[PDB]
Amino acid sequence: NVKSVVNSSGKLVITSRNTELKLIDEFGRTKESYKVPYGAVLAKGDGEQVAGGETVANWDPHTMPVITEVSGFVRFTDMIDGQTITRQTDELTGLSSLVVLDSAERTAGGKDLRPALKIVDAQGNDVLIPGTDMPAQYFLPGKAIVQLEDGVQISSGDTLARIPQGGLPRVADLFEARRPKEPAILAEISGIVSFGKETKGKRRLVITPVDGSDPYEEMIPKWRQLNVFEGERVERGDVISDG
């Protein structure tokens, strides 16, 4: 379950959360199984051969990575200063740009407007993502600090922005079938995912199947950091919020 692409450095970076790495001898028996996180850097490719004590993956879990599949110019859409974003500059480092204000922090005018960044070519046309027809458009959540200013070319794997991050009773709970704290959110059915009403008590989400039950929707609180992608299809065996 690997969904990888070749970065600008020539290495292979996996964009699938459910990727498993197996060390299988010539006899066909799997001996070691590891998990490769999203955005990791693979020194070697699938099907190759490595020796013992050799690093094969490297990732950065300190800050969540947000990257663009395509490479090209970035243009800011629905970016109005003082209504949806703020101008904050570091006093010491000097490497900072506009920061995406949260809905509860911005003004009333920018509440109904969703800021986003779109990827275009040298001609200004929206570069269609390979394999799909949708334009290369990506929304930015709250507390997002865009790293590169408008009109600067990027490459695959470039960060768009940075946001901040047993015993007997255990057996008794397992045999009593008690729901844990922070229940992991999973998709009930497969299909595309989209947003709905905002700040109506709690946020809502809509799952539109390809040929299934469209009107299904699920209420999800907006205070919990979700990890869904409305621009990507999600299967029923997918993790929406980790836990």
* Contacts for 28 with CB less than 8 Å, ≥ 6 apart: none
Q: How far apart are CA 113 and CA 76, in angstroms?
A: 13
Q: How far apart are CA 84 and CA 139, in angstroms?
A: 12
Alpha helical stretches, state H, 10-143: none
**For residues 98 and 81, is the Cβ–Cβ distance under 8 A?**
yes
Reference 241, options 221, 222, 223, 227; nearest CA is 227
Q: How far apart are CA 242 and CA 226, in angstroms?
A: 8
Q: How far apart are CA 67 and CA 5, in angstroms?
A: 12
Q: Is 103 exposed, middle or buried (0-12, 13-18, 19+ CB in 10 A)?
A: middle
Q: For 1, how many CA atoms within 13 A lie in the half-sphere containing its CB?
A: 13
Reference 34, options 51, 58, 3; nearest CA is 58
Instruction: Name residue 13's beta-bridge partners.
Output: 5, 41
Give Cα 3 distance to the centre of its chain. 13
Q: From which experimental method does this structure derive?
A: cryo-EM
Structure tokens at 97: 């740009």
Residue type at position 104:
A
What residue ranges in the chain does DSSP mark as E strands? 4-6, 12-14, 20-24, 30-35, 41-42, 57-58, 73-77, 85-86, 99-100, 116-120, 137-139, 144-146, 161-162, 185-186, 192-195, 204-208, 217-219, 239-241
Alpha helical stretches, state H, the chain: 168-176
Residue type at position 171:
V
User: How far is residue 54 from each of residues 10, 42, 43, 44, 49, measured CA to CA in Å?
Assistant: 19, 12, 10, 10, 11
Q: How far apart are CA 176 and CA 126, in angstroms?
A: 54
Q: How many residues does the chain have?
A: 243
How many CB atoms are closer than 10 A to CB 4?
A: 17
Give Cα 102 distance to the centre of its chain. 18
Contacts 24+ apart (CB under 8 A), 189-198: 189/213, 189/216, 189/236, 190/233, 190/234, 190/235, 190/236, 191/233, 191/234, 192/230, 192/233, 192/234, 193/228, 193/229, 193/230, 193/232, 193/233, 193/234, 194/230, 195/230, 198/103, 198/222
Q: How far apart are CA 99 and CA 88, in angstroms?
A: 7
Structure tokens at 242: 């980790």
- Residue in the block written with tokens 């029923």: 236
Q: How far apart are CA 73 and CA 150, in angstroms?
A: 8
Structure tokens at 64: 């969540």
How many CB atoms are closer than 10 A to CB 211?
A: 6
Residue type at position 142:
G
